[PDB]
Coordinates of C-alpha atoms and ligand atoms in Angstrom, one line a residue:
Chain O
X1 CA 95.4 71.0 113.5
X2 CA 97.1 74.4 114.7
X3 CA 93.6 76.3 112.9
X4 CA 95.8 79.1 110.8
X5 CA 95.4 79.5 107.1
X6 CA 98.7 79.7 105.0
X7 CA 98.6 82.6 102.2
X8 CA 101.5 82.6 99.6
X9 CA 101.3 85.9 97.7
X10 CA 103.2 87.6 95.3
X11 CA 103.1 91.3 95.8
X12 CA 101.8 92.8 98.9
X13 CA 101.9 96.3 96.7
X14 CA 99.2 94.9 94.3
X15 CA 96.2 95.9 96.2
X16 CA 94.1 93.0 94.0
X17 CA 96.2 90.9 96.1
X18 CA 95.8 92.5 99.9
X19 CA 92.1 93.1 98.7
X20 CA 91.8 89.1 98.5
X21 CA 94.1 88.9 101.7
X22 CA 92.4 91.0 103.4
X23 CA 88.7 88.9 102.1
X24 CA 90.4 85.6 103.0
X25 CA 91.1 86.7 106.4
X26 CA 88.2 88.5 107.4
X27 CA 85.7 85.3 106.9
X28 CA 88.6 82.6 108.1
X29 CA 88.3 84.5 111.5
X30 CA 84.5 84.3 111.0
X31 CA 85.1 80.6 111.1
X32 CA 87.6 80.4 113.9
X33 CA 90.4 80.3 111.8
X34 CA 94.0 82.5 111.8
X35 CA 95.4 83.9 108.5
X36 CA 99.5 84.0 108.5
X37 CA 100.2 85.8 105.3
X38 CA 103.7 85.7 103.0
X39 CA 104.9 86.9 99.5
X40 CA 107.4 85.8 97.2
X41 CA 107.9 88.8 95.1
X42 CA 106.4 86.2 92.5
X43 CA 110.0 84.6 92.2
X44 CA 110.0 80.9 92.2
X45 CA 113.2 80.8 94.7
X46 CA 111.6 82.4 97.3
X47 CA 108.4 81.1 96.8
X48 CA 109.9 77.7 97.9
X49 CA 111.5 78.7 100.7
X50 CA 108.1 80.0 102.1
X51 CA 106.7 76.4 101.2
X52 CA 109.3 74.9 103.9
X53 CA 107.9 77.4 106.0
X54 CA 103.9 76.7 105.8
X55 CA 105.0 73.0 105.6
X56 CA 106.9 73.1 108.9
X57 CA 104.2 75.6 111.4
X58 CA 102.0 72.9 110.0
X59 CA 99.5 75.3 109.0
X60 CA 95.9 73.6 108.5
X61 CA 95.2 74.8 104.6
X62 CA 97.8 76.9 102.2
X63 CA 96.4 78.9 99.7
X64 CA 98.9 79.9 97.0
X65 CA 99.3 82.2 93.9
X66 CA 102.2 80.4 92.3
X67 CA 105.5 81.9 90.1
X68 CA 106.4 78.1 89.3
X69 CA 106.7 76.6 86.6
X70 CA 103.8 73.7 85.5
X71 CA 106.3 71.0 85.4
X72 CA 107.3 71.5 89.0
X73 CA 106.1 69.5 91.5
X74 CA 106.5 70.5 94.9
X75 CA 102.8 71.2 96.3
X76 CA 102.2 67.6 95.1
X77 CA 104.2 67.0 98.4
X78 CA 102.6 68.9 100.8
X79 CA 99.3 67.9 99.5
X80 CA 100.5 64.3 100.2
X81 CA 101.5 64.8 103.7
X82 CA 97.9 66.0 104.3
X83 CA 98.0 69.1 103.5
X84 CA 95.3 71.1 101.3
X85 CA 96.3 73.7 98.4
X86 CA 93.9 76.0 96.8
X87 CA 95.5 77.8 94.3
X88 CA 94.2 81.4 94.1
X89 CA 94.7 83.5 91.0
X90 CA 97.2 81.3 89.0
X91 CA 95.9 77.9 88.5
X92 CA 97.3 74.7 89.7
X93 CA 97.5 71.4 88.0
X94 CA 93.4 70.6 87.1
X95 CA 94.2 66.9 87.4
X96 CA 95.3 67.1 91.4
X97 CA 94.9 70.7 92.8
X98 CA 91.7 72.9 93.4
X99 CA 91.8 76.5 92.0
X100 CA 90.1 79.1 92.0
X101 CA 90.5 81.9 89.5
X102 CA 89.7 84.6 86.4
X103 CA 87.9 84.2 83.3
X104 CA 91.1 86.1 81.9
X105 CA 91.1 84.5 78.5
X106 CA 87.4 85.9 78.3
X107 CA 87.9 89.4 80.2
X108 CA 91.3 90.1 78.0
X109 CA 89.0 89.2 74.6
X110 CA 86.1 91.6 75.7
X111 CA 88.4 94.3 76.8
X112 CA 90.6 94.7 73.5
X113 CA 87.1 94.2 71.5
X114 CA 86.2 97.4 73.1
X115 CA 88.5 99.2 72.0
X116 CA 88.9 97.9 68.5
X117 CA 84.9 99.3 67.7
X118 CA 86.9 102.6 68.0
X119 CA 88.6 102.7 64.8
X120 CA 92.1 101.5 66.2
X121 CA 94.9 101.8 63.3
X122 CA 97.1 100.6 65.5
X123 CA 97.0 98.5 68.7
X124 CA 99.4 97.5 71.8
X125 CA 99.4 94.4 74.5
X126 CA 101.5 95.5 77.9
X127 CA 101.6 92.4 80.0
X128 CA 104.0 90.7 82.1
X129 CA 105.7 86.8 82.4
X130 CA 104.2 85.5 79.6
X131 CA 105.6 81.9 81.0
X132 CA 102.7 82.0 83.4
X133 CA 99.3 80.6 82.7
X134 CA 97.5 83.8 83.2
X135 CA 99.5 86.0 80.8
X136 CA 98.6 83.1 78.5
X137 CA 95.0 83.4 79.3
X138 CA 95.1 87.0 78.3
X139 CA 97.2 87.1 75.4
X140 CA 95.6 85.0 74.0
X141 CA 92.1 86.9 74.5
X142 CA 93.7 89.6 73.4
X143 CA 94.6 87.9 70.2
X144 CA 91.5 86.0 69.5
X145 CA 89.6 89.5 69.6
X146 CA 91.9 90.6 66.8
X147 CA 90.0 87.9 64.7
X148 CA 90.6 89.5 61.1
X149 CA 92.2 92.8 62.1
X150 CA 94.3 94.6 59.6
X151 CA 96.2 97.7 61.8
X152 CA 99.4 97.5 63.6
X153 CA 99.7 94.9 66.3
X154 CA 102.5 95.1 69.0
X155 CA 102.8 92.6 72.1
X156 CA 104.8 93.8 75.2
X157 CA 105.8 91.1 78.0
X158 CA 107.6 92.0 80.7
X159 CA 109.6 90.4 83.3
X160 CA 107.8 91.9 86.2
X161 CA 103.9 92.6 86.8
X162 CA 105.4 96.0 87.9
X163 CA 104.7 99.4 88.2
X164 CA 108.1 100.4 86.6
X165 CA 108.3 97.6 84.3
X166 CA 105.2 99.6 82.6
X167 CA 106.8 102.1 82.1
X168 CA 109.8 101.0 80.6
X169 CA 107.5 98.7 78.4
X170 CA 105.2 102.1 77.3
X171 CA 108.7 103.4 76.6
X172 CA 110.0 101.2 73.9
X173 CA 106.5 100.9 72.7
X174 CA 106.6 104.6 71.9
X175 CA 109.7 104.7 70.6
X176 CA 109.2 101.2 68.0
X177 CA 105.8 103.6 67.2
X178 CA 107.4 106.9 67.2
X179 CA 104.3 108.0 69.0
X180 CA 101.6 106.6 71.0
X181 CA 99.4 103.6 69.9
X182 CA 96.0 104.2 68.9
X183 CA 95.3 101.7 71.4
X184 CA 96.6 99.7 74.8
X185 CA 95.7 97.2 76.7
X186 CA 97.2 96.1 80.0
X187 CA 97.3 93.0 81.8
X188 CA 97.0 94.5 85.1
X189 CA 96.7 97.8 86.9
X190 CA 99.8 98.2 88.2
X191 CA 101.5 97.6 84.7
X192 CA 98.9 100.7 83.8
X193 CA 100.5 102.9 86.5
X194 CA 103.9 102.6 84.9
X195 CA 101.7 103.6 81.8
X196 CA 100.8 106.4 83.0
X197 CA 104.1 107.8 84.7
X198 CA 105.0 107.6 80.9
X199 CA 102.3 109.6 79.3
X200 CA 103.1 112.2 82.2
X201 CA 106.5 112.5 80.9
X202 CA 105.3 113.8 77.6
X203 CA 103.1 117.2 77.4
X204 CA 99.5 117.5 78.4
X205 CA 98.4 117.5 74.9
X206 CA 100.6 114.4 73.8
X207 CA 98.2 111.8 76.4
X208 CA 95.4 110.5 74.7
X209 CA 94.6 106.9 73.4
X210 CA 92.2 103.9 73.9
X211 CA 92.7 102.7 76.7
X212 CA 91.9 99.2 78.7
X213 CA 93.1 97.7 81.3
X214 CA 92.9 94.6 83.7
X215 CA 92.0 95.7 87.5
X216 CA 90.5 99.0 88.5
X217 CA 91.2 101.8 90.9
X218 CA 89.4 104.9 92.3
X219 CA 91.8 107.0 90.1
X220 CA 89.9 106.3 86.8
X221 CA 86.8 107.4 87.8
X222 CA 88.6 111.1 87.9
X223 CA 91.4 110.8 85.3
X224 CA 90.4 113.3 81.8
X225 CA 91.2 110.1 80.1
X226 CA 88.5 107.4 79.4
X227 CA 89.8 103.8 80.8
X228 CA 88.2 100.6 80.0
X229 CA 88.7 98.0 83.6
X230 CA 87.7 94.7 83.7
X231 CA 87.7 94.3 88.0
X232 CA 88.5 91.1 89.8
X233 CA 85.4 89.8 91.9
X234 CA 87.7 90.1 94.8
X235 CA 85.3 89.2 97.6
X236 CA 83.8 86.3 95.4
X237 CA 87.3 84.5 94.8
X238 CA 88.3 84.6 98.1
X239 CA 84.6 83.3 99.5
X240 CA 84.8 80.6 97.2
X241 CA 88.4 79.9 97.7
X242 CA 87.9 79.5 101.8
X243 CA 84.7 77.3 101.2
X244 CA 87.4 74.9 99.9
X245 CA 90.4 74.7 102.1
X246 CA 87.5 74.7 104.9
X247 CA 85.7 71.1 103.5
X248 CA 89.1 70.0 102.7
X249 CA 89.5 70.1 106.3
X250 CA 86.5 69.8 107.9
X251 CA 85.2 67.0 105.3
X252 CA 88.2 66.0 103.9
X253 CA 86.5 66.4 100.9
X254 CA 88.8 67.7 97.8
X255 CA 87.9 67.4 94.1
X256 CA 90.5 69.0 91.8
X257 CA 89.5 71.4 89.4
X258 CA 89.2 75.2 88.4
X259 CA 86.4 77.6 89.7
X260 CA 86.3 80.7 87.5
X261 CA 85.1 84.3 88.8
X262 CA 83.8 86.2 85.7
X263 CA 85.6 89.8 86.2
X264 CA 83.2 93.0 86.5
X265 CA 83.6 95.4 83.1
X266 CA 83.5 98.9 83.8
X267 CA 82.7 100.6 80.7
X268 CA 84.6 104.7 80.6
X269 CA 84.5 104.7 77.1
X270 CA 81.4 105.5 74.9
Chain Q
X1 CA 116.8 80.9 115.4
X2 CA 113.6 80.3 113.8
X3 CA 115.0 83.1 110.9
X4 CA 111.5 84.1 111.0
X5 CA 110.2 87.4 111.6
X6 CA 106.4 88.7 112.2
X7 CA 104.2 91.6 111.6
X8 CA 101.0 92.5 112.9
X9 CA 99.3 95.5 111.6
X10 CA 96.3 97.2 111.0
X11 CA 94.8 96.8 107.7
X12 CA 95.7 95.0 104.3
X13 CA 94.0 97.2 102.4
X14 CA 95.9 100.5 104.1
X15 CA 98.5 100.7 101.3
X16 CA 101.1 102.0 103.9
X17 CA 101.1 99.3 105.9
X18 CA 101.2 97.0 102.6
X19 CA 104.1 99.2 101.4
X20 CA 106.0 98.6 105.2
X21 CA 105.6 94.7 104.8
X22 CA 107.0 94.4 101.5
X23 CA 109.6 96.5 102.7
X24 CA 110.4 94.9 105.6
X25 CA 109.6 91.6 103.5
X26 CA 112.7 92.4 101.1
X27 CA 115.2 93.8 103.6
X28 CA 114.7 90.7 105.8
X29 CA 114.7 88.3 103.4
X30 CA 118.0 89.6 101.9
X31 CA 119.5 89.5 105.8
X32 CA 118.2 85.6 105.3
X33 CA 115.2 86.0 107.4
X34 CA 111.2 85.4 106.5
X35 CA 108.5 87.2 107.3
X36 CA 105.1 86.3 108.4
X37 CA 102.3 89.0 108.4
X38 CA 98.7 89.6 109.8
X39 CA 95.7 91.6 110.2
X40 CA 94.2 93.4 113.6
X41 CA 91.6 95.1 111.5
X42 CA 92.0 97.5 114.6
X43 CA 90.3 95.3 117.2
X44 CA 92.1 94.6 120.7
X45 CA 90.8 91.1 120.6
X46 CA 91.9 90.0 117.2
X47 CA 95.2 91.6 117.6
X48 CA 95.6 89.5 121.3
X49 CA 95.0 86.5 119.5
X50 CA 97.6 87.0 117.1
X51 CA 99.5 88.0 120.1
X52 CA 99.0 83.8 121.0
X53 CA 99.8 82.9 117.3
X54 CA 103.0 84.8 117.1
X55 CA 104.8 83.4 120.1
X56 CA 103.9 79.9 118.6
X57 CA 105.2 80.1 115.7
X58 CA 107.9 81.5 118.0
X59 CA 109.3 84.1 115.2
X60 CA 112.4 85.7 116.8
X61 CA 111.5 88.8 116.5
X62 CA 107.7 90.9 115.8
X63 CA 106.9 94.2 114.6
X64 CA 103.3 95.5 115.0
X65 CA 101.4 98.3 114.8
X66 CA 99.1 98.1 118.1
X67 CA 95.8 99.0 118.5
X68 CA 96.2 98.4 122.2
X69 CA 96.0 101.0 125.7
X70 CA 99.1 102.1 127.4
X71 CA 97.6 99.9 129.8
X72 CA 97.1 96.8 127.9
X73 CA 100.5 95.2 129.7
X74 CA 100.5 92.0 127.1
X75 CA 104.1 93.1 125.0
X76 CA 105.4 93.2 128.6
X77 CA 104.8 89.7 129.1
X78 CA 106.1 88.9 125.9
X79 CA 108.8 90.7 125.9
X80 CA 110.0 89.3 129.6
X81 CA 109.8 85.8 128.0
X82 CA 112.5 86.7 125.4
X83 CA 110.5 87.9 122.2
X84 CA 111.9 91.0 121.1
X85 CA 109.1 93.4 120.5
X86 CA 109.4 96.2 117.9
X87 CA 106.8 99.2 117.4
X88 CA 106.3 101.0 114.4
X89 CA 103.8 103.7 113.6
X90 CA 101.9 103.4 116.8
X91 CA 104.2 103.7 119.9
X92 CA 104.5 101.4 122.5
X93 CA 105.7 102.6 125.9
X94 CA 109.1 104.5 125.3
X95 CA 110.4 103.1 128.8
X96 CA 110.3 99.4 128.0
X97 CA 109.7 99.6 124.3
X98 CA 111.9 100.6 120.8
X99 CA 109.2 102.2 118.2
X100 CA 110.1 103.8 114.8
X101 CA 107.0 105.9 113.8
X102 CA 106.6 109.6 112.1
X103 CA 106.5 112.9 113.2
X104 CA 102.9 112.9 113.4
X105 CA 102.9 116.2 115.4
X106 CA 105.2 118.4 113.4
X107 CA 103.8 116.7 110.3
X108 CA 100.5 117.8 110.5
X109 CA 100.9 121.2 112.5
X110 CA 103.1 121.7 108.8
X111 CA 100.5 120.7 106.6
X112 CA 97.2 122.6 108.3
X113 CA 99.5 125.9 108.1
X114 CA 99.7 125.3 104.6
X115 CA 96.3 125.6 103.4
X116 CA 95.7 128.9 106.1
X117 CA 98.1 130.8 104.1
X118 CA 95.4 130.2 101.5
X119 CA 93.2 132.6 104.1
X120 CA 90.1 130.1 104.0
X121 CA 87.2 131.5 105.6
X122 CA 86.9 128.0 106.9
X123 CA 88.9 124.6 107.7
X124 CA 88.5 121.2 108.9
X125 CA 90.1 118.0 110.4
X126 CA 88.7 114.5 109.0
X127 CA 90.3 112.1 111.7
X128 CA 89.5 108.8 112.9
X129 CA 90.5 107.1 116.1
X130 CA 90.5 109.4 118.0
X131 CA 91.8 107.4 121.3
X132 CA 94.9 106.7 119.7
X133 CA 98.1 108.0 120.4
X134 CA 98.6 109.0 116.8
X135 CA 95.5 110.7 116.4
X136 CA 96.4 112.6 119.5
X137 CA 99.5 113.9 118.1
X138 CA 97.6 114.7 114.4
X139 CA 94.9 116.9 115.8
X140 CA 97.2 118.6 118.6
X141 CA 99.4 119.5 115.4
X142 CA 96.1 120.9 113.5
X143 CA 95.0 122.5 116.7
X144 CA 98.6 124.0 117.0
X145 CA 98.8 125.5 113.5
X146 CA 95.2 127.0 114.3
X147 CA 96.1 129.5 117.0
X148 CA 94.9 132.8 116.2
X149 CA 92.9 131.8 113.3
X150 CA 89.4 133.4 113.4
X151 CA 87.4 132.2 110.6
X152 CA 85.2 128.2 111.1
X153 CA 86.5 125.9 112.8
X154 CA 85.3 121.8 112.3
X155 CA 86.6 118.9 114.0
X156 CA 85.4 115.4 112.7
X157 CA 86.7 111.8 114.0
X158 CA 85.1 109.0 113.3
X159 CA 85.2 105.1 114.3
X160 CA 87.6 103.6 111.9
X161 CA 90.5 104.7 109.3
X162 CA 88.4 103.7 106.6
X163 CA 87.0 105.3 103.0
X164 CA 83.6 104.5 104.1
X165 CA 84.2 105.8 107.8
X166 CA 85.6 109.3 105.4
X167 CA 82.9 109.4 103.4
X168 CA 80.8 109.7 106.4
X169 CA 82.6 112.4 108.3
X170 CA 82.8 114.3 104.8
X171 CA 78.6 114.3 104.4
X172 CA 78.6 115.1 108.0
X173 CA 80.9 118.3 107.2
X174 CA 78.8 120.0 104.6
X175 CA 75.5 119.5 105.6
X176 CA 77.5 121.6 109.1
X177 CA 78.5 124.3 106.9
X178 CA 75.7 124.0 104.0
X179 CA 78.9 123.5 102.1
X180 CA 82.3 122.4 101.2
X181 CA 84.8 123.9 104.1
X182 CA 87.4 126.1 102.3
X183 CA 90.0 124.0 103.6
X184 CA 90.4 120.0 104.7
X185 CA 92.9 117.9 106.7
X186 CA 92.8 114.5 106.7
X187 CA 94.7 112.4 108.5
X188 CA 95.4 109.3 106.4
X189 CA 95.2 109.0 102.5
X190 CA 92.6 106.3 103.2
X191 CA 89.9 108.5 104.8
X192 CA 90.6 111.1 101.7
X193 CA 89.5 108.5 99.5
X194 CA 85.8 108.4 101.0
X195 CA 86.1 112.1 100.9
X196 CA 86.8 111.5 97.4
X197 CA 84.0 109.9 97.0
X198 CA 81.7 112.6 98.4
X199 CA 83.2 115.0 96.2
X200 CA 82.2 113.2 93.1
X201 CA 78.2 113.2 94.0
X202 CA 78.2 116.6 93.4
X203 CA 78.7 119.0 90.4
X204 CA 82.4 118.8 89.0
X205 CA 81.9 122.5 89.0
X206 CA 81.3 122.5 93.2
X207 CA 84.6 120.0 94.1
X208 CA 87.3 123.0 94.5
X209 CA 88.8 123.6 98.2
X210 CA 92.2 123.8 99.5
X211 CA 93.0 119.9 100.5
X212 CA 95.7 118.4 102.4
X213 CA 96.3 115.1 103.8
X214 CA 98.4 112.4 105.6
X215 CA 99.8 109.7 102.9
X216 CA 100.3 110.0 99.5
X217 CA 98.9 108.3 96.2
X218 CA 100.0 108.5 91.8
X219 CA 96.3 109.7 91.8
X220 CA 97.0 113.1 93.7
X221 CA 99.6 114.0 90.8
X222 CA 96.8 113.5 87.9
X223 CA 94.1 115.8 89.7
X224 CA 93.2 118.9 88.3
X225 CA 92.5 119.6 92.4
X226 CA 96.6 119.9 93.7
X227 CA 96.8 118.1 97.0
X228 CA 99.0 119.1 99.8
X229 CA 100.4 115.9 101.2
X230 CA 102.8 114.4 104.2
X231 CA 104.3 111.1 102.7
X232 CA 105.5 108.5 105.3
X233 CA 109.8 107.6 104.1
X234 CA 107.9 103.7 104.4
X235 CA 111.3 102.3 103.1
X236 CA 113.3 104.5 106.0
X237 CA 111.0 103.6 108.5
X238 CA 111.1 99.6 107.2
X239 CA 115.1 99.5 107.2
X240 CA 114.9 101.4 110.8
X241 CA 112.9 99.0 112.5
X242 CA 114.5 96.1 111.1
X243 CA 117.8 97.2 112.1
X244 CA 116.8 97.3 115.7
X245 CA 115.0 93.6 115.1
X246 CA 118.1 91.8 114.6
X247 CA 120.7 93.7 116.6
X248 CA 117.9 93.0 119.2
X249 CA 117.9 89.2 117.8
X250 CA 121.6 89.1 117.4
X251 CA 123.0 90.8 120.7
X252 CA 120.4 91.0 123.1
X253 CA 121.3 94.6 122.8
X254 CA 117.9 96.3 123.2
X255 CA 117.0 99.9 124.4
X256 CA 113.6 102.1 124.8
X257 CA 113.1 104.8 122.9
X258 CA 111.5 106.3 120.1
X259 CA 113.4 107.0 116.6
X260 CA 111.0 109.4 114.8
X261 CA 111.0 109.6 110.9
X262 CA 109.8 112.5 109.3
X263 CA 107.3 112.5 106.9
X264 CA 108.3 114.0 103.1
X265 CA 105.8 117.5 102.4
X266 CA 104.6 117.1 98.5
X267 CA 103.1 120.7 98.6
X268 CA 101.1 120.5 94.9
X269 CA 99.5 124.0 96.4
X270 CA 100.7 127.2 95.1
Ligands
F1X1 O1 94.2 92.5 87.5 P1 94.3 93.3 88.7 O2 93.3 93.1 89.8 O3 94.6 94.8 88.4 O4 95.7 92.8 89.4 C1 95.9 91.5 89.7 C2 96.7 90.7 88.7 O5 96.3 91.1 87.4 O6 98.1 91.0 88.8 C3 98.7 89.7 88.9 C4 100.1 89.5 88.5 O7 100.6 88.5 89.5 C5 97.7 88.7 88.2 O8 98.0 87.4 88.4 C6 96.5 89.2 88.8 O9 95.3 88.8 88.2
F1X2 O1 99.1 108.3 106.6 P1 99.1 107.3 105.5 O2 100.4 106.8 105.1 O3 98.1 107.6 104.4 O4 98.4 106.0 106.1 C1 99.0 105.4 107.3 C2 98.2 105.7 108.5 O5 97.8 107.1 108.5 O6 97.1 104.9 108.7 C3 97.1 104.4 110.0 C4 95.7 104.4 110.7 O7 95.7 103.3 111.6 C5 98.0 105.3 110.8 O8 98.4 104.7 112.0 C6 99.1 105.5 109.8 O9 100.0 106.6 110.0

């Protein structure tokens, strides 16, 4: 035992991410535990080296949202040495890891079925690393709501869930549309903020469209322009993701599988 | 060498401080170093016990924002045994100690003058903390830039630098002046947020007065409301205070003193 929690994040700037950090360690001291927190920049090099890391200060639990690829095996390790994983955000392996995560196939489906009963000629996905499970997820709801739909369809994925990989991805969108999309949907606030540092670039009367988007943030509830969020259950996750690393170690107890968190739909859009 | 590195602040959810650690994530990773990060949430006791953790994990060098008195003598003892100790935002003591924060003083004397040119027959501070050596320095600034001014005068510091704890203070304000003040200081973007929020409750026809605030968000730039606002250089401020971590790692080589970094004036008002 040395009672500290391991948390392997990806980007300390994505407040989804501190939000959950910030969750996790507020009810691990409750418990009597420490919280040592860590990102990778959500690349699989140095995501590794900060597995050595937790593995070595023998930290009691890690909890992980994980860059790697499915195939690789590493956590299998730790986990084997004693040490419990509970993936966070981006599953693990169902058949030996418990996760907990997003309904994102659901929540992307719901969110680009908003938009369509809006008359939509044409229609835009902005996403990010779609090598990873979760852009998977929400392509693919994204796609399944476009169940017999006739208008333009363009998917974006970039190589960074980045605030200025949105807006080089709205760029080439509105150049391969000469214009703006009747519709957009991104895969994550922070892709939306690049978004929007686009539409800023053009006149005031050249930024208007249906929009959705993954996350939230107190800015939409001011912005002239409608968004549609679908918000993480930030609080939830994080409860239910330190009820496991805690009877993992206190019960050693462990039953792999994934735990999914419906996400909250905020509505802007009549 | 341990080649780790660690960082207590404040709060997770105080994008600042987020923006700091990634900064100071990416600079020491790239000089082959990790870094290891946790939350005081503000509270003496939590941040002693990551004191404890800290010199377990025996990282070879840690930053931190402290919470803690000028006579809290704890870094001394840590510091004696070897650990290089580095301060940023809040100062430690300047004879022992090497801190990299703001110009807190000069930045907010600069940013109250700014909305008096405006002539409001009113103005007010939103602080929090009000024990702290940086909130000391932000309302002798305010007070500073106030000399001479004849019209109402409010002071309001509250418990915690929090959007709830500015929300508060905010409600407390009008129901003082049986209305908005024509002019606001806050000093952090975090309590604007809550004052944000108090704004909304009422008529979007009854939300004008001359604001300006410590920090800086993409949401001030999309107001209709402009927004005066002192920036933190969080990237000058990161590289500063890693530079004196490993020369002080690296050499031994470590002197007091405070290197002070100014903060960058958006002024949005006319
Ligand atoms: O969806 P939000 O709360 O706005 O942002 C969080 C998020 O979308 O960004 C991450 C990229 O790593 C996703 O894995 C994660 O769900
Ligand atoms: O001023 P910002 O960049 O908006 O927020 C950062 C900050 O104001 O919040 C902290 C409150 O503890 C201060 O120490 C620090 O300067």
């Amino acid at each position: 035992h040395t009672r500290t929690l391991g948390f392997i994040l990806p980007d300390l700037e994505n407040p989804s991410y501190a939000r959950i950090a910030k969750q996790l360690e507020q009810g691990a001291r409750a418990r009597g535990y420490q919280l040592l927190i860590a990102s990778s920049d959500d690349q699989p090099d140095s995501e590794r080296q900060l597995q050595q890391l937790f593995r070595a200060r023998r930290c009691d639990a890690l909890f992980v949202a994980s860059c790697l690829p499915p195939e690789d095996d590493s956590y299998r390790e730790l986990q084997d040495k004693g040490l419990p994983v509970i993936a966070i955000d981006r599953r693990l392996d169902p058949a030996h890891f418990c996760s907990v995560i997003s309904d994102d196939r659901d929540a992307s489906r719901q969110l680009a079925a908003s938009l369509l009963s809006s008359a939509p000629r044409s229609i835009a996905l902005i996403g990010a690393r779609p090598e990873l499970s979760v852009s998977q997820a929400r392509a693919g709801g994204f796609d399944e709501a476009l169940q017999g739909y006739t208008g333009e369809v363009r998917r974006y994925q970039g190589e960074a869930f980045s605030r200025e990989c949105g807006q080089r991805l709205m760029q080439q969108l509105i150049d391969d549309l000469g214009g703006l999309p009747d519709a957009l949907v991104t895969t994550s606030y922070v892709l939306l903020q690049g978004v929007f540092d686009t539409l800023q670039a053009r006149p005031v009367d050249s930024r208007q469209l249906q929009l959705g988007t993954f996350g939230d943030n107190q800015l939409l509830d001011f912005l002239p322009l409608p968004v549609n969020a679908m918000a993480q259950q930030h609080g939830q996750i994080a409860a239910t993701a330190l009820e496991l690393a805690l009877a993992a170690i206190e019960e050693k107890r462990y039953e792999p599988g994934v735990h999914a968190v419906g996400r909250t739909f905020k509505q802007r859009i009549s």
